[PDB]
Amino acid sequence: DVAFDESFFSFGGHVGTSVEYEDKVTRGFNNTDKKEKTITNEVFNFFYNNPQWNFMGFYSFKIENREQKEPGYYENEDGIKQLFSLNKGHDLGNGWATGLIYELEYTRSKVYSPDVSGLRKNLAEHSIRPYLTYWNNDYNMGFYSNLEYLLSKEDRNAWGKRQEQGYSALFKPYKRFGNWEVGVEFYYQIKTNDEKQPDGTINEKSDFNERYIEPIVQYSFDDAGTLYTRVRVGKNETKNTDRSGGGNAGINYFKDIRKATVGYEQSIGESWVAKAEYEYANEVEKKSRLSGWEARNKSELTQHTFYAQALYRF
Incomplete structure (x- = not known):
């Protein structure tokens, strides 16, 4: 009934x-x-x-x-x-x-x-996420949760194709007290990776899992904006089968992940909203076995990201 009683064209956003x-x-x-x-x-x-x-x-x-x-x-x-x-x-x-x-x-x-000059790639990532939420008005707490199916298909033409398929689960309890909001994200993902050349030659066949835990703390100024910080601790593993290529058959990769994000959001008048966010990430990866040409058993990512947004509400 609702689809006929309330119009598709009655919306905000x-x-x-x-x-x-x-x-x-x-x-x-x-x-x-x-x-x-x-x-x-x-x-x-x-x-x-x-x-x-x-x-x-x-x-x-x-x-x-x-x-x-x-x-x-x-x-x-x-x-x-x-x-x-x-x-x-x-x-x-x-x-x-x-x-x-x-x-x-x-x-x-x-x-x-x-x-190469103008090698074409296209990447399609499909995510299906059923979710379940609860909120208690009296205790000012509840949780967000979801499952996810993720299908990733990459066509890189001359460099071949790559498909990733997997599932994840997320549970985020959180509470509000006065102007504060505090919560923690718990996350787990499993995935398979398959990468091949146009040849049919296998570059990678591996199993992947990741876990992270990410507390978030947020404070909303009555007369200003919302300041928030998130700290993530995570790890993941990539386990190559014996059919993997590139010297990676049977090789396992282990990654330690540390991130920190600080952000600020400000509503401005009736319609506009502004947001800026900074993220630092540091991820260290090691192998179960070195092949012979590697200098060291360590690959370290250090990453700085800055983001700024302005939106108009209607």
Whole structure:
């Protein structure tokens, strides 16, 4: 009945834009630096919210430019990343709700290096996430939870194809007290990786799992904005089967992850909202066995990301 009693065209939401700058250095197993800078210009994003339908939608258009430099090598990659998502919710009563999210992130790009000129890639990442939420008004606490199926398909033409398929689970209890909000994300992911050449030759066949724990602390100034910090501790493992290629058959990779994010959001007058966020990430990866050409059993990522957004609510 609701789809006829309340119009599809009765909705609110926002239109926004953002910029992101990412500065990444990976000192790999040969003890040399791979330096990458990525600038992302979100020229348009659109949020559709139809509360009467309990129905939300999101669309994003991002221009991405990445430059990579290493000893004796460079790589530039230019493309567009789009995101389309739908969220249908259902109120279960007594503080409970559920719903289903479908999300597609799709990126087409071109790569330029000493070896290739305009090699085309496209990447489609499909996410299906049923979720379950609870909130108690009296105790001012509750939780967000979801499961996820994730399918990632990358076509890199001459460089072959890569598919990742897996599941994740997330549980985030949280509470509010006065102007504070505090919570912790618990996350687990399992995934399989398959990468092949057009040949049919296997580059990678591996099993992956990741866990992280991420507390978040948030304070909302009565007469200003919302300041928040998140600290993530995580680890993951990539376990190559015996059929993996590139000297990686039977090789296991182990990664320790540390991140810190600080952000601030300010509503400005009736319509606008501004947000800035900084993230530091440090990830250290080791192998179960070195092959013979590696300088060291350590590959370390250090990454700085800054993000700024402005949106207009309607």
